[PDB]
Amino acid sequence: GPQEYTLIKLKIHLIPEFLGSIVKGREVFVVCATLRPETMYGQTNCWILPDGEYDLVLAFDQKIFDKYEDTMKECNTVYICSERSAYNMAYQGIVPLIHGREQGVSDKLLPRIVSLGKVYGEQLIGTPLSAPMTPYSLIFILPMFSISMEKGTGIVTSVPSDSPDDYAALRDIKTKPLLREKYSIKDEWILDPLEIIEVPGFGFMTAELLCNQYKIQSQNDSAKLKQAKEEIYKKEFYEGILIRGKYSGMKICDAKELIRESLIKDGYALIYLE
Amino acid sequence: GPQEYTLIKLKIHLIPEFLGSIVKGREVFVVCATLRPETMYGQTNCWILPDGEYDLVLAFDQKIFDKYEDTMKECNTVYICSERSAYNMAYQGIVPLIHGREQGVSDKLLPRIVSLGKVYGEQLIGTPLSAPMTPYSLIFILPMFSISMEKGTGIVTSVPSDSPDDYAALRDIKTKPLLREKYSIKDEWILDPLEIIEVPGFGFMTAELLCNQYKIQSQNDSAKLKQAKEEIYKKEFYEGILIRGKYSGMKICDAKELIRESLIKDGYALIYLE
Ligand SMILES: CCOc1ccc(Cl)c2c1[B@-]1(O[C@@H]3[C@H](O1)[C@@H](COP(=O)([O-])[O-])O[C@H]3n1cnc3c(N)ncnc31)O[C@@H]2CN
Numbered sequence: 001g002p003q004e005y006t007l008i009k010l011k012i013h014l015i016p017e018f019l020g021s022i023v024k025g026r027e028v029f030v031v032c033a034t035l036r037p038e039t040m041y042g043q044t045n046c047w048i049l050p051d052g053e054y055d056l057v058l059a060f061d062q063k064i065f066d067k068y069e070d071t072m073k074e075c076n077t078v079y080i081c082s083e084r085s086a087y088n089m090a091y092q093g094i095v096p097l098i099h100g101r102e103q104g105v106s107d108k109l110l111p112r113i114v115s116l117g118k119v120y121g122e123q124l125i126g127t128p129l130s131a132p133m134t135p136y137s138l139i140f141i142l143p144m145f146s147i148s149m150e151k152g153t154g155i156v157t158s159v160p161s162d163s164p165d166d167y168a169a170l171r172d173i174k175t176k177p178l179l180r181e182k183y184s185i186k187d188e189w190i191l192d193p194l195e196i197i198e199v200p201g202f203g204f205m206t207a208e209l210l211c212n213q214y215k216i217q218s219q220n221d222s223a224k225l226k227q228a229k230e231e232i233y234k235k236e237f238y239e240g241i242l243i244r245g246k247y248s249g250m251k252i253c254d255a256k257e258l259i260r261e262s263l264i265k266d267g268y269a270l271i272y273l274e
Numbered sequence: 275g276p277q278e279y280t281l282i283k284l285k286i287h288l289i290p291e292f293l294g295s296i297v298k299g300r301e302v303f304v305v306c307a308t309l310r311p312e313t314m315y316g317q318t319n320c321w322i323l324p325d326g327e328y329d330l331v332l333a334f335d336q337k338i339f340d341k342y343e344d345t346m347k348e349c350n351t352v353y354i355c356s357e358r359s360a361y362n363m364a365y366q367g368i369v370p371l372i373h374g375r376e377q378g379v380s381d382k383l384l385p386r387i388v389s390l391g392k393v394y395g396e397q398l399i400g401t402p403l404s405a406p407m408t409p410y411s412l413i414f415i416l417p418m419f420s421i422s423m424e425k426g427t428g429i430v431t432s433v434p435s436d437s438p439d440d441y442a443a444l445r446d447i448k449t450k451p452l453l454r455e456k457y458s459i460k461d462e463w464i465l466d467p468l469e470i471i472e473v474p475g476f477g478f479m480t481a482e483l484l485c486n487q488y489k490i491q492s493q494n495d496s497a498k499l500k501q502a503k504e505e506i507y508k509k510e511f512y513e514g515i516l517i518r519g520k521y522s523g524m525k526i527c528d529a530k531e532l533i534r535e536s537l538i539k540d541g542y543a544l545i546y547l548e
């Protein structure tokens with residue numbers, strides 16, 4: 001590193017009781033790291049690690065505070081993310097830090113994030129979200145088992161048309177009916193992929209082709225997925241043509257940063273480094 | 275961590291040729307991390323690791339830039355510090371980042387610091403510096419061998435009256451005449467300690483007493499130094515009375531943050547986390 005990402009804010013549309021008691025009326029967002037802001041037009045769902053443990057982090061609504069109470073008064077926004085990502089967010093001014101009282105005495109200043117609580121990925125499966133740019137009104141949180149808690153926020157947005165991982169993990173849900181009974185996954189949470197990008201070689205549903213081309217059978221086949229992902233990434237950046245949005249018609253390489261800046265302008269996204 | 279520090283900017287008063295060719299007319303500062311902003315009244319010298327390798331980092335004069343040339347135009351300030359500290363500075367907005375061209379292709383953004391070059395601590399020994407708050411007009415860079423390159427910036431300010439390390443390392447220079455011949459250390463670079471803080475138990479030159487009390491013989495006796503340092507730190511914060519500056523008369527615990535904020539206001543210091 002360091003590597004640069006776009007942090008995508010997915011707004012919880014209906015906050016459940018178990019969070020509502022802790023967040024007390026604040027806006028809550030699930031926050032995902034992506035390398036591909038231009039693909040937000042094709043989001044079908046959101047991915048979380050079922051046994052991942054995530055923080056409920058107090059965030060700026062968009063200086064290190066001395067009082068917990070003043071931060072709590074001044075921030076009306078919570079981000080669900082890995083503790084680890086929250087610290088990176090803090091260094092970079094995205095969430096507040098306070099001078100913590102949890103250890104030591106007043107002769108040292110120990111900056112800490114304000115974490116209201118802890119939440120397991122499992123508990124969030126089924127949560128409705130307003131996401132930017134996708135035509136779907138609401139998309140839903142679903143389990144992905146390939147998620148590393150040591151990268152990004154541990155939360156990942158799903159664009160199955162142009163991500164081999166996302167295609168593979170949604171297919172595992174679509175086929176394996178034990179998986180759906182287990183996590184109590186309703187049918188209406190599983191949304192259809194969307195055509196968003198033309199790749200002149202492969203057409204408009206490039207992730208499925210590549211998953212067939214590498215003979216990928218589930219989300220777990222990581223060595224092959226890695227090869228699919230590296231191929232799709234470069235070919236789509238240089239040769240992919242957007243068929244959605246303001247920059248419809250343009251190549252990804254020419255539109256990507258413009259799309260990213262409009263998401264940032266509109267409050268859907270932030271620049272993030274780790 | 276994370277731990278909070280004050281970054282002290284020590285301005286090079288006479289920039290030598292070997293740096294002048296690389297920095298090309300820019301203001302240069304040597305940057306030190308301290309836990310004790312209130313002790314800047316007693317600075318006698320600055321400490322560097324002789325075989326430490328430091329960056330010449332482009333800094334804001336006080337958004338990730340796409341062009342090296344625009345950063346170079348917009349920044350007239352260089353900070354000498356460890357590469358590692360510079361990255362922390364970058365995350366925290368203290369020095370610019372650029373989208374680097376050193377590896378890969380334009381499909382990924384790789385934020386990098388702008389390092390003009392490399393410099394060994396040895397090469398800086400004898401450099402004259404304007405430091406804040408000390409009565410001395412100029413203080414000088416000298417070698418300290420206990421410095422860890424994995425902490426702070428690898429550069430440390432020297433307050434021998436109230437730091438056991440600083441007292442011990444200056445004494446090693448004062449006594450050991452081979453050490454002075456080796457690094458070519460002139461006499462006029464070795465400045466006398468200054469009384470700055472009364473500790474009701476020990477008086478006004480508390481570091482020397484403690485070095486005697488722990489029977490500390492050189493800067494290398496780290497296990498004992500650790501005990502001296504932990505004792506002096508807490509006793510001075512809670513019981514130490516300043517005899518210098520605007521808050522002369524006051525206890526350190528009441529003056530410390532006020533002093534720190536005035537250094538920040540006046541452009542001598544910055545808040546720094548690692
Ligand atoms: C690798 C190509 O990634 C692609 C390719 C196509 C598309 Cl359409 C996308 C992405 B990408 O998914 C996120 C993020 O961008 C990408 C970050 O990859 P890097 O190795 O951590 O640098 O991996 C995914 N990611 C982020 N955090 C993750 C985590 N904790 N665990 C597993 N995967 C994660 O976003 C879109 C929609 N998913």
Ligand SMILES: CCOc1ccc(Cl)c2c1[B@-]1(O[C@@H]3[C@H](O1)[C@@H](COP(=O)([O-])[O-])O[C@H]3n1cnc3c(N)ncnc31)O[C@@H]2CN
Pocket residue numbers: 277307308309310313420421422423424425426427428429430431432433436437438440503507
């Ligand atoms: C430990 C008490 O430190 C004292 C005690 C008294 C006084 Cl008057 C001072 C400090 B203190 O010296 C710096 C800095 O503050 C302190 C940081 O200690 P922590 O363990 O890295 O958190 O250690 C020192 N330090 C910073 N970076 C260092 C490094 N890379 N290597 C060795 N020591 C370093 O500042 C003043 C003037 N020197």
